[PDB]
Amino acid sequence: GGGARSGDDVVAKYCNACHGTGLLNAPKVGDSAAWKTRADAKGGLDGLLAQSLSGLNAMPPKGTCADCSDDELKAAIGKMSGL
Amino acid sequence: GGGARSGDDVVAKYCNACHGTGLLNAPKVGDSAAWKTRADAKGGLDGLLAQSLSGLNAMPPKGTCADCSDDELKAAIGKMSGL
Ligand code: HEM
Ligand code: HEM
Questions:
Q1: Domains of chain A
Q2: Which of A25, A36, B48, B79 could form a disulfide with B1 if both were Cys (CB 3.0 to 4.6 A apart)?
Q3: Which ligand is nearest to the CA of A57?
Q4: Among B56, B57, B65, the residue to mutate for chain A (most A Cβ within 10 A)
């Protein structure tokens, strides 16, 4: 989605590992549906990002790339998601 | 290893998911070696526990079972490990 670094670059270098396959029940990429009821649950594109940073269960905290700015985490959420 | 609940119970209900297979490069169960150079690196059985709680990379924080006392986390470390 957006742009810090990518999400193209970010999904592929960090996010890939679970979201690609669906490993651990990771909401898979392009799966507009799954991601939707999610935003729903946490009030938009900020409930996923505020969510990734914190982490949830088996989803490791901060998406990962403990390097990432907040803008990148959202761009890789933007593009795992659809929106 | 030790006893809060188990680690038998704990490894099997929470820890299983990655350490069983080796999913995500999770140091597998019984693998005395792998776990050893680990304790080494973080000064004993407290560098894994202080470690799990915090989490590291793809290892989700607090082993998981965000329920667990510290004594259980160590007993499931005791028994993933060998020691
Ligand atoms: C890459 C930095 C990355 C981001 C960003 C990210 C985000 C993310 C969101 C927003 C969710 C939904 C959380 C919610 O419902 O609020 C989510 C869910 C899971 N993720 Fe993730 N995720 C990124 C990458 C990774 C990686 C590399 C892993 C595997 C170690 C992983 C795993 C998961 C899992 C599992 C879930 C579902 C967890 C659950 O909802 O029970 N993600 N992720
Ligand atoms: C169950 C509550 C559980 C515990 C406890 C636990 C501990 C643990 C330790 C001590 C390490 C070594 C960390 C270090 O080197 O200091 C470790 C490593 C990894 N784990 Fe784990 N772990 C438990 C369970 C789980 C589960 C359910 C997952 C999968 C979502 C998982 C994953 C991993 C991974 C991956 C690693 C290696 C991470 C890395 O060292 O790069 N663990 N765990």
A1: 1-83 (1.10.760.10)
A2: B79
A3: 1
A4: B57
